[PDB]
Design a protein around this ligand. Sequence first.
Ligand code: CHL
Ligand code: CHL
Ligand code: CLA
Ligand code: CLA
Ligand SMILES: CC(/C=C/C=C(C)/C=C/[C@@]12O[C@]1(C)C[C@@H](O)CC2(C)C)=C\C=C\C=C(C)\C=C\C=C(C)\C=C\[C@@]12O[C@]1(C)C[C@@H](O)CC2(C)C
Ligand SMILES: CC(/C=C/C=C(C)/C=C/[C@@]12O[C@]1(C)C[C@@H](O)CC2(C)C)=C\C=C\C=C(C)\C=C\C=C(C)\C=C\[C@@]12O[C@]1(C)C[C@@H](O)CC2(C)C
Lengths: 212, 217, 165, 194
Amino acid sequence: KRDAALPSWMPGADLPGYLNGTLPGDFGFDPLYLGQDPVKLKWYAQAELMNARFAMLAVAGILVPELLSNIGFSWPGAGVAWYDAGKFEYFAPASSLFGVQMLLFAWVEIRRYQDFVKPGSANQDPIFTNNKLPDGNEPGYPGGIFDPFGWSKGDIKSLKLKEIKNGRLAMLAFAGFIGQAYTTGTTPLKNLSTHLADPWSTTVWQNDLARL
Amino acid sequence: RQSWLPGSQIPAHLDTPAAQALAGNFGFDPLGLGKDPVALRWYQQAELIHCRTAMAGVAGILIPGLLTKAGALNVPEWYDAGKVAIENSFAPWGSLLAVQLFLCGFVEAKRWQDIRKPGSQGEPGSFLGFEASLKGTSELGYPGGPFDPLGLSKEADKWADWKLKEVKNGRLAMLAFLGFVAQKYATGAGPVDNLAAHLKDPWHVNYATNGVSLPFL
Amino acid sequence: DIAGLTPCSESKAYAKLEKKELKTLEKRLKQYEADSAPAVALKATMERTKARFANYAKAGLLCGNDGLPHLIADPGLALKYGHAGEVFIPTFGFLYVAGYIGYVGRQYLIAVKGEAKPTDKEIIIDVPLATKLAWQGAGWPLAAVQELQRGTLLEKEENITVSPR
Amino acid sequence: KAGNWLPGSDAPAWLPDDLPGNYGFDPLSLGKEPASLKRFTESEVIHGRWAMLGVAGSLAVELLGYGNWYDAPLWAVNGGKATWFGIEVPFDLNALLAFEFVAMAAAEGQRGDAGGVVYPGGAFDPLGFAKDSSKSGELKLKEIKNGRLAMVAFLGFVAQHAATGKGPIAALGEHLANPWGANFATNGISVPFF
Ligand code: CHL
Ligand code: CHL
Ligand code: CLA
Ligand code: CLA
Ligand SMILES: CC(/C=C/C=C(C)/C=C/[C@@]12O[C@]1(C)C[C@@H](O)CC2(C)C)=C\C=C\C=C(C)\C=C\C=C(C)\C=C\[C@@]12O[C@]1(C)C[C@@H](O)CC2(C)C
Ligand SMILES: CC(/C=C/C=C(C)/C=C/[C@@]12O[C@]1(C)C[C@@H](O)CC2(C)C)=C\C=C\C=C(C)\C=C\C=C(C)\C=C\[C@@]12O[C@]1(C)C[C@@H](O)CC2(C)C
């Protein structure tokens, strides 16, 4: 039932009709029919954006710090694996940092949720009432102060597709960090160097068979 | 029409519009226990209370157990916690239990009287202004009001799905607790210890080799 | 202990009784050869006898001066001193099975009274109908209470024949 | 309407606009019935007034150096003697209970008979600040807002003392000394896995 002009995750396949192509990154992939219900699909679309944008920040926050250390840049946190950052000594105890984090994230997340329930109802600054986001925004794409450079005024449809594509790739990358670190016990870029050193004897088959 | 046993004859008393409006109706009543409509209404309340208590109880055994294994917490086995807690307690278990019966008895009595006369606990003047919030909703077993702080039940388009999830997880939790009791006697270890032992060697560590469940073999 | 009794595990008469019973079997076992069938049968009886006296003592039965186990029937004494498995627990075992039989039979009787010839279903059993009712009788305690609460368990006095008075 | 507790939300219809301190906050719909709301309106003001006295008293004792609010009654259980601003008070615990019960019963009995008179005025308004109706609207809002703040503050005293065991003034000093090492997240009870 899906339009044949739309791109497909499996060329030639007959895909569900409810994925009509409005959402970005709509390739008709839903073999388990999780998004069949329109009410749940609405929630999943936002959840995909949220997990996708945190994954992109997280992946960039795990490679660049490791890349800089390998280059030679020196700073107190250099050379610390992403899975050992918790034990590192910061200016404040980790417990107090977590407490501040939840209070700050309670404010912004409840503001974001208010918009999802009633879009356009959280666009106004509560203190400096003059400030406000433009009235045309949609859930998940605030704009206004969140888009200071005005990129959203261009080809928005292409930009949203680029965002979700990079986001889906970042989500897989973070899942790779968990699996690779758990099985190899080393940082992701060290794993890449091992693979490039001898690609033909460093596959997951080679590595896991040895550990078997 | 989803059934617990595809191709079997669904009981007639579970195919009525009233019965099919119950959450989790898969046509399962081989003993005909719910054949009487009045009894089915009472047993539906019993299933919800067992579901919700089992879910809270099993979560109070499984989550602390998993965290204890991970080292986040240090909680004893569910079957030893009562003794450990009472030693460091401020009251003997007899006085602790008696207070529990008084407090539980009071709220259970109010729920009991609501089953017999739905909405009757909203009788003006009975409670100190709070009776208005004790009328419940149009469905027995779903009080709402102060019992639903986030107001998730107000979403009509999601109401049927919420109820099905509750009964499905509730039925699963009840079987999990029955599994904990059986596995405690069969193996003499904790539920997470049983899970780890099975995963270590699934084909040699199970109930067919515990020496209790299958005596004929 | 309870009512002047003593545990069988601590009773001299109980221990003496076991010796006499085994002694009687041992005397008979002398006239048979080691591998002969009578010898095997007698030794099997001896093993069962030793297990029996071991099990009863383990169960915590009280013995009288005669050295024989005595049962405790008062629920309070039975539950206070761990004798609930003698009378109290067996009590509810029986009543469950007995009510099961009675309830299943009552259901069959009521079911066939709506047939064309009820008396023919009482000498030629409707086995398919009887079998279905037998399996559903496991929940009789629940079903019986509901009939009692619904007022359908009993018949009204106006429909029961009585003699002149 | 004082304001909105949840920007973008709709105020409940059953909360009157003129009701002082009305931010449209009733997610549980406890005040939906007019009879229930009438009782709750009085109870909130009574709670707020006691909390304002309770918080002001709790701070004054510790600021003036007579200990914290929690340790004040210990003399009645450790065999001590009562003091007020340092001067001994001859009464004992049994006498205090008897006089307080009689005095409060007479005073609270009179209030109960009035039938939910939140703002009596008259003898209770000697300076006549609320004599005018037009000005009373703003003053009632200030009373309920300071009262709601005091109720939260007292809950803070009780919760903070249970976690830390120190007085409200001592806790404030400790937080000011090491803000990032002395807070609810570092007391070892509020946040579990730390
Ligand atoms: C996206 C979320 C997220 C993820 C995936 C992780 C993942 C991880 N954190 Mg991290 N954290 C995350 C958010 C946060 N962490 C912390 C604070 C910490 C701390 C303080 C520690 C970790 C550690 C860990 C590791 C746990 C496994 C381990 O070694 O156990 C075995 C555990 C240990 C060997 C640690 C023993 C010493 C430790 C001081 C004991 C107390 C630890 C706390 C209970 C941690 C609580 C973390 C919770 C709040 C998220 C793992 C790599 C641990 C680590 O890096 O270990 C090498 C660690 O010590 N995290 C905060 C608060 C700012 C977070 C906030 O969002
Ligand atoms: C009230 C509970 C309940 C009960 C007692 C049954 C009972 C039954 N259902 Mg029913 N169902 C029940 C609820 C439900 N069923 C279904 C849906 C179905 C379907 C679709 C079917 C049945 C069928 C059956 C029968 C299977 C006969 C058998 O020997 O299977 C043998 C059982 C198994 C092979 C499963 C054993 C699982 C094992 C204990 C767990 C192992 C998990 C490990 C992870 C595995 C290890 C890893 C691997 C890789 C080695 C059986 C009479 C089947 C039938 O015969 O229908 C006519 C059937 O086709 N049921 C639903 C969903 C609506 C239910 C919801 O509550
Ligand atoms: C985002 C994609 C991605 C990438 C680029 C890599 C890259 C690498 N992985 Mg990792 N990995 C990923 C995801 C990824 N992984 C995920 C999701 C998991 C969880 C199952 C793992 C689990 C894993 C293990 C357990 C191991 C590696 C290892 C490796 C190395 C290659 C050898 C091997 O056995 O690969 C196997 C990798 C896979 C089977 C991942 C398949 C899934 C991805 C998403 C496929 C994407 C295909 C698509 C065309 C894009 C690829 C190219 C693009 C990125 C430019 C290399 C450093 C090995 C290593 O560290 O060697 C030293 C190793 O032992 N990975
Ligand atoms: C058939 C009649 C019958 C008779 C003659 C007895 C006789 C006795 N019972 Mg038993 N009992 C019976 C039926 C009977 N019981 C039944 C049907 C039940 C189940 C509901 C019980 C449950 C029960 C309990 C729970 C206890 C006894 C106890 C006793 C003994 C002392 C109490 C007493 O005065 O009882 C005379 C009996 C009656 C007047 C009839 C009603 C008895 C009620 C049900 C129990 C009264 C308990 C009593 C208040 C305990 C006081 C403290 C104790 C330490 C002495 C006494 C030998 C007590 C005992 O010694 O336990 C070791 C005890 O604790 N009985
Ligand atoms: C309530 C419940 C469990 C509650 C558990 C709690 C509170 C546990 C609490 C604690 O653990 C903590 C947290 C911590 C510990 O330290 C201490 C304790 C105190 C121990 C289980 C119910 C468990 C209930 C169970 C298992 C019920 C199963 C019923 C079945 C299978 C019925 C089947 C049928 O009736 C049908 C539906 C139709 C008929 O026609 C046919 C038949 C077959 C008769
Ligand atoms: C926190 C509090 C109440 C909070 C209520 C809340 C949040 C209710 C919220 C909601 O209901 C609404 C509104 C609407 C619903 O739809 C939703 C919910 C969410 C349900 C009351 C405190 C109330 C606090 C009060 C009254 C405190 C009184 C204190 C006194 C008198 C203290 C006296 C002394 O301290 C001295 C001075 C000296 C010491 O030595 C001795 C003593 C005796 C200790």
